[PDB]
From a paper:
CaM is a highly conserved Ca2+-sensing protein encoded by three independent genes CALM1, CALM2 and CALM3, and all three encode an identical 16.7 kDa 148 amino-acid-long protein. The dumbbell-like structure of CaM comprises of four EF-hand motifs, each able to bind one Ca2+ ion. Moreover, Ca2+ binding induces a large conformational transition in CaM that exposes hydrophobic patches within the helices of the EF-hands, which permit interaction with a wide range of targets.
Numbering used by the authors:
A (entry chain BBB): 1 to 21
B (entry chain AAA): 5 to 148
The structure:
C-alpha cells in the first residue's frame, strides 16, 4: 500500500530530526 | 536561510509540538521517538532537550529548533528529505531498495511487517520490473 511507503518516509523524516537533538 | 527552508523546518516543528503551544517538552519528544521504534530513557530525553534549550527554560521553542536544524541539515527541502531517506534505506548503496533492506527499514522505524506486504510494496513501486526499487521509482511512490 502507497500509504505504508508514505508512513516510512514520514517516520524516517522524524528520525532524521531526532538525530539533530 | 530561505523562507522555503524555514517553512519546511516550521512544518517539522509542528510534528513535535502536537498541542500547538509553541514549545517542545521532554514528553512530546519521547512521544515522537516511541512512535519511531525508539525507546529513550528520561535521562536520554532530558540530555537531548538541554543540548538544544538555549535560554534554559526546559522546553524547545521554534527559534532554538531552527538554530539546531540550520547546523548540519543540508538543503532540507521536500526533494532533499526524499533523497536522504533513500540513501538510509539503500543500506548496501547499489542504488536499489531490496526486500531485505525494506524489512530492515520497517523494523528500524517500528513498523510490523509481512513478506506479503513487502512483496506488494515492491510490486506497486517497481516500474521497470527488476524486482527492486530505484530512486526514480521511490520518488514516484513518495511525491505521489
Ligand atoms: Ca508543545
Ligand atoms: Ca527554551
Ligand atoms: Ca541496496
Ligand atoms: Ca525497479
Amino acid at each position: 500500500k502507497k500509504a505504508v511507503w508514505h508512513k516510512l518516509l514520514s517516520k524516517q523524516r522524524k528520525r532524521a530530526v531526532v538525530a539533530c537533538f | 536561510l530561505t523562507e522555503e527552508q524555514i517553512a519546511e523546518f516550521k512544518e517539522a516543528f509542528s510534528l513535535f509540538d502536537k498541542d500547538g503551544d509553541g514549545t517542545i517538552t521532554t514528553k512530546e519528544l519521547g512521544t515522537v521517538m516511541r512512535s519511531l521504534g525508539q525507546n529513550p530513557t528520561e535521562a536520554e530525553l532530558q540530555d537531548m532537550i538541554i543540548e538544544v534549550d538555549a535560554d534554559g527554560n526546559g522546553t524547545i521553542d521554534f527559534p532554538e529548533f531552527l538554530t539546531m536544524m540550520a547546523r548540519k541539515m543540508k538543503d532540507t527541502d521536500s526533494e532533499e528529505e526524499i533523497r536522504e531517506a533513500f540513501r538510509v534505506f539503500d543500506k548496501d548503496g547499489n542504488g536499489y531498495i531490496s526486500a531485505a533492506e525494506l524489512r530492515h527499514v520497517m523494523t528500524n522505524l517500528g513498523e510490523k511487517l509481512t513478506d506479503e506486504e513487502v512483496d506488494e510494496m515492491i510490486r506497486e513501486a517497481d516500474i521497470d520490473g527488476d524486482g527492486q526499487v530505484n530512486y526514480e521509482e521511490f520518488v514516484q511512490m513518495m511525491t505521489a
